[PDB]
Amino acid sequence: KKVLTLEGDLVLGGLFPVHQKGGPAEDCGPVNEHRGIQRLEAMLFALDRINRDPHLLPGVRLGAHILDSCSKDTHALEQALDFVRASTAITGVIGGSYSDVSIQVANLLRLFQIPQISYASTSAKLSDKSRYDYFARTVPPDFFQAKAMAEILRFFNWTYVSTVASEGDYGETGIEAFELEARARNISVATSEKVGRAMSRAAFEGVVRALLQKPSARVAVLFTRSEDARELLAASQRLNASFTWVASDGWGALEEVVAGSEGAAEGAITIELASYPISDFASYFQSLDPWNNSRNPWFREFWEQRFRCSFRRDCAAHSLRAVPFEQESKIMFVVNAVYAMAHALHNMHRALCPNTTRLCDAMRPVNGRRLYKDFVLNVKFDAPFRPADTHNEVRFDRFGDGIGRYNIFTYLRAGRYRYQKVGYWAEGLTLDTSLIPW
Amino acid sequence: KKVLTLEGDLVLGGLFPVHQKGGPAEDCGPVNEHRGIQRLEAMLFALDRINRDPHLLPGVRLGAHILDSCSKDTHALEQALDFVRASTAITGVIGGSYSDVSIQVANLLRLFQIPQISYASTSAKLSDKSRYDYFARTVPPDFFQAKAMAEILRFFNWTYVSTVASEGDYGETGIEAFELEARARNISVATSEKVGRAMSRAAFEGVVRALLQKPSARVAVLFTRSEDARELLAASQRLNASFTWVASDGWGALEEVVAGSEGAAEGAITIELASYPISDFASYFQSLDPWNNSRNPWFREFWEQRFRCSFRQRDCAAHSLRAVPFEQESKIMFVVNAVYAMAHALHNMHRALCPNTTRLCDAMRPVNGRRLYKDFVLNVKFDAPFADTHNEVRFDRFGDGIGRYNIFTYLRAGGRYRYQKVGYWAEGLTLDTSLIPW
Ligand SMILES: *[C@@H]1O[C@H](CO)[C@@H](O)[C@H](O)[C@H]1NC(C)=O
Ligand SMILES: *[C@@H]1O[C@H](CO)[C@@H](O)[C@H](O)[C@H]1NC(C)=O
Ligand SMILES: *[C@@H]1O[C@H](CO)[C@@H](O)[C@H](O)[C@H]1NC(C)=O
Ligand SMILES: *[C@@H]1O[C@H](CO)[C@@H](O)[C@H](O)[C@H]1NC(C)=O
Ligand SMILES: N[C@@H](CCC(=O)O)C(=O)O
Ligand SMILES: N[C@@H](CCC(=O)O)C(=O)O
Ligand SMILES: [Cl-]
Ligand SMILES: [Cl-]
Ligand code: NA
Ligand code: NA
């Protein structure tokens, strides 16, 4: 229903799982605090900074037309019609998160030559430029995540494993790639399970029971969406079932996956893409207020849900400074996707509009084929808001993908349950066995 | 670039793979004589009959707007925008052939609530009405075909087999369903191979080689697209490899698959949806003439290919479709039935919305797609044109057809090679050891 509109000379599209998947009839569910709100706000932060930047499109304002995917490819695609209907023109799209969402959206935007930059979609299917010719991403393909996951097993001599894959382009392509890597290291698969789009608590229990039918396969490798990783952990908890979980970025370092199921989750090894916190973001975010942030139509809902109050009194009294703030793992890539589009446009403007700083005729409208092929693919700049002791640059390969760098974690009970970095993967596995309590 | 347009009070969209997929350079390849031209002609034959049927839309003429998918979902989608650009009006769409084409097209037509009836897409994925809520088919899902294939292996006691699947929604979903059915019948897979969308002749040879590495498994189960089955057989020929093929409807009883590779194909068991010849279609098709077939934009191109002639060279008139042999394409019955299904739906809607006239009343200008699909398309029940007994045209709760398959064996007699109907599957396997020569 709602849309976040911000005005400008060039309008950037945006797609975020602001809401979780709806019920059996509802299309949209509850607010996604981390991968929704924080991620969307990060696009707003980035845009704000680009529009105050004398070196980045100094005479061209970048607007936004941001949509909620509701963590659902079908909802996202009905919403995405807004990007293509003027065929107010959309110059390029930032998103989405889920691969199923970015794939559906890419099939649509290529028809209208609209460049797309995802900040979290890691499915390897997206590397195919015969199919997704207008898509690029600031994250790498799962090509590399799979290989890392297999090297992790091979390191601890975990040679008889089970797999759980969410149905679709992320889960299915993720685990297949994992299996080929595992075979090559003499790792055999006991059983392979799939998780449907619509599964009951009972259905999930049946998956856990299916994994328990192979008592020798204590290690379970997941290439699952967050919600499926959550639901599977919750079923393990309800059945006092014990597995050593090795999981992909879907689960990653999210506290909402493990909440309520800490016991079942304890001892898990998870992977998240390597990133850094961006100070200026935490300041921007924690300073948001429901009276000052009206441009975000989903902020009021988040505020009510976070503080368990209603404006319809004293809800306004709360502060995001008063509460603990943990920055989402992929915030970096959100900010980098927007800057990649902004630098692409600025470079296009430098080549096409030399006599002015305003949008010339050559950019009324912007040719998407030229934009993607000649400028988006060719950006190369220092990551903005990166810490002074870090040397990250934003660029894409020939196929529009980012560079394969991951962090590796363990979920342990310290007596709070926390995520602990125990290593990394960067064209080879590195891990400190001292940090893992087994 | 071309489109078949016919005038009517109501315009039915069409989607056929008139061309094969392009090469490394091109988008479209050579003409598809059987599953392209013949299937398309069957829609035209069907529209003509309905347009002179005194008991089926006697006052509403059905026109057409037929498109070439080029055996490729990206191309098909670029073409399918023609169907949705009204927001001339397209009432419903007939097609496509390939599952990947039908799925993508459905992902678009649902957004504009356009009913779609496929005559050949068998992917079990298309049974999901939470995703493909405007899709129906005159064919059953591959859930039944995979069961039939597994049952054949079981009967002949073929415990150790290999699998070859095509990349996509047909190959991948179908072979995963056979894999389920093989497990449950104590049948084990030696190796699972996958064929890509753009493989080469040397790459096809490597799949054959990968299969040969496991010499205990001489039986290869295929869930492949015709072009892949053709290419894979050619490589088995070239490398003098010997396998017992068990193929799905993709191969079916197509002579183009086995042409020039007959030796490598001997003994092969194939599945194909049970269908009957339509003599009137045969006569009609054989009567077609480069000079009387102006309404089909691709027919002059089909003639030059089929008869290796050229209209510029004035050497095409010499040939006839009457002087050459005529094998009806196995799924012609489902093309006709799909067209009629939509006609009956529109007729039934007319009875309800225009009671005082045979002409299109205002209550059906425009036709409401939601109502057409939900209240009329899913509810049709009529005897299939061309025995009025109890073999009818109707859709199940998931908008699918009835699981009836003929089983064939490729053999030689009195070179010369043929497909021999050695059995069937219609709620259980019913083959015959007498007709199989081994
Ligand atoms: C895995 O096995 C090798 C070889 O037997 C051994 O050297 C290594 O220490 C083992 N790794 C772990 C983490 O147990
Ligand atoms: C949970 O499982 C472990 C291992 O089988 C067992 O020692 C423990 O008592 C179980 N607890 C319950 C309540 O089932
Ligand atoms: C399969 O094996 C069973 C049991 O050994 C046997 O009765 C049956 O005839 C065999 N089928 C064929 C086709 O040889
Ligand atoms: C093909 O292989 C068979 C069995 O080894 C053999 O009889 C036949 O002569 C071979 N043909 C060629 C051309 O190598
Ligand atoms: N990388 C996951 C998305 C997980 C995330 O949103 O961070 C995917 O490709 O669907
Ligand atoms: N069953 C195949 C179509 C093959 C045919 O067109 O005959 C599919 O779903 O892609
Ligand atoms: Cl998303
Ligand atoms: Cl098609
Ligand atoms: Na600026
Ligand atoms: Na009629």
From Swiss-Prot, chain A:
Residues 1-438 are extracellular. It is a multi-pass membrane protein. It comes from the Eukaryota. Glycans are attached at N157, N240, N292, N355. Keywords: Cell membrane, Cell projection, Disulfide bond, G-protein coupled receptor, Glycoprotein, Membrane, Receptor, Signal, Synapse, Transducer, Transmembrane, Transmembrane helix. Its main location: membrane. L-glutamate binds at R35, R39, S99, A120, T122, D249, K330. The lineage of its organism: Eukaryota, Metazoa, Chordata, Craniata, Vertebrata. Disulfide bonds join C28-C70, C309-C315, C353-C360. It is found in: Cell membrane; Synapse; Cell projection, Dendrite. Forms heterodimers with GRM3 or GRM4. Interacts with TAMALIN. Interacts with HTR2A. (Microbial infection) Interacts with H5N6 virus protein HA. This is Metabotropic glutamate receptor 2. Detected in brain cortex (at protein level). Widely expressed in different regions of the adult brain as well as in fetal brain. GO terms for cellular component: astrocyte projection; axon; dendrite; glutamatergic synapse; plasma membrane; postsynaptic membrane; presynaptic membrane. GO terms for biological process: behavioral response to nicotine; cellular response to stress; chemical synaptic transmission; G protein-coupled glutamate receptor signaling pathway; gene expression; glutamate secretion; intracellular glutamate homeostasis; long-term synaptic depression. Belongs to the G-protein coupled receptor 3 family. Dimeric G protein-coupled receptor which is activated by the excitatory neurotransmitter L-glutamate. Plays critical roles in modulating synaptic transmission and neuronal excitability. Upon activation by glutamate, inhibits presynaptic calcium channels, reducing further glutamate release and dampening excitatory signaling. Mechanistically, ligand binding causes a conformation change that triggers signaling via guanine nucleotide-binding proteins (G proteins) and modulates the activity of down-stream effectors, such as adenylate cyclase. GO terms for molecular function: calcium channel regulator activity; G protein-coupled receptor activity; glutamate receptor activity; group II metabotropic glutamate receptor activity; scaffold protein binding.
